[PDB]
Amino acid sequence: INNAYDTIMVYYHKLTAIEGRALEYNNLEKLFELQKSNYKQLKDCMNDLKNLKTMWDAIALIHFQYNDWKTKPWRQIKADILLDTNKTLGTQIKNLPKEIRNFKGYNVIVEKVKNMGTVLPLVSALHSEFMEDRHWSQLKQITGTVFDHNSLSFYFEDILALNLYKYENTVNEIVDVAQKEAKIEKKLKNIEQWWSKQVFEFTEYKETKTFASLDNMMEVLDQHSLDLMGMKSQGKYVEFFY
């Protein structure tokens, strides 16, 4: 921000010198085209300066969204990060499409914003909590990252070191295997709940307790078993609790 206002001074100095020329030309007069063209040269540099102005302005707004991100890492929160990840992704996409023309080297800035969006997709995955620590460790082994699934609040900065582009495929492949396991586990939890809580009550006949309405729960076992048959039938995530 200081460098920008500093540049602002250098341009004002150039505009002054720019004037001191435009004076000298008109003073000379005599209808010389070379006087007006040196001016056409200067006006070019002034417009380029104005482009650089709007560029530095975009960078400042970018740092403000980057500053809001680090505050949300410290805040963390699974439910908060997912909502934060959605809106930030929307705002980031909005800024990049707004950027156009100007000078060269702008692509360098746009890629930095592109890297910012990839991390926003990863934050939403931590938000869902579809991966355990065991899943986080296997990916961490391949990743070789010291920080685990839920290590600390400053982990958003550490996740940066592992390139989003270089380590999205592995993390995506890791997060995908986790979701299949979260689904695979939930069926085991749905199945474990069915057998944990059941009741075959004793209905008295003549002088004997009997299994009446045993079919109703007998039907639930056939479905759970057909799940468990389906659970054994492949499932990458099945294998762990298979």
Q: Provide the minimum distance between the beta carbon of 54 and other proteins in the complex, in angstroms, as a whole number.
A: 8
What does the buried/exposed string (b/e) look like for 150-184 if buried means 16 or more CB atoms within 10 Å of the residue's CB? eeeeebbeebeebebeebbeebeebbebbeebbeb
- Cβ closer to other proteins: 91 or 216? 91
CB atoms within 10 A of CB 81: 23
Is 32 in contact with 25 (CB distance < 8 Å)?
yes
Residues 65-84 contacting other proteins, CB under 8 A:
67-68
Residues 131-160 contacting other proteins, CB under 8 A:
none
Stretch touching other proteins by CB under 8 A, among 27-35, 54-62, 137-145, 224-232:
54-62
H helix and E strand count, the chain: 8, 2
Stretch touching other proteins by CB under 8 A, among 26-34, 52-60, 113-121, 173-181:
52-60
Residue 239 sits in the site that holds other proteins (CB under 8 A): no
d(CA 200, CA 198): 7
Return the beta strands (E) in 42-123 as ranges. none
Size of site (CB under 8 A) for other proteins? 10
- Cβ closer to other proteins: 53 or 183? 53
Is 91 in contact with 72 (CB distance < 8 Å)?
no
Q: Provide the minimum distance between the beta carbon of 60 and other proteins in the complex, in angstroms, as a whole number.
A: 5
Question: What residues contact residue 34 under an 8 Å CB cut-off, 6+ apart?
Answer: none
d(CA 52, CA 14): 15
- Cβ closer to other proteins: 1 or 79? 1
Residue 1 sits in the site that holds other proteins (CB under 8 A): yes
Instruction: Select the residue interacting with other proteins from 23, 28, 46, 60 (CB under 8 A).
Output: 60
Residue 100 sits in the site that holds other proteins (CB under 8 A): no
Residue 64 sits in the site that holds other proteins (CB under 8 A): yes
The two three-digit tokens of residue 185, written as one number: 């586990």
| Contact positions vs other proteins (CB under 8 A) | 1, 5, 53, 57, 60-61, 63-64, 67-68
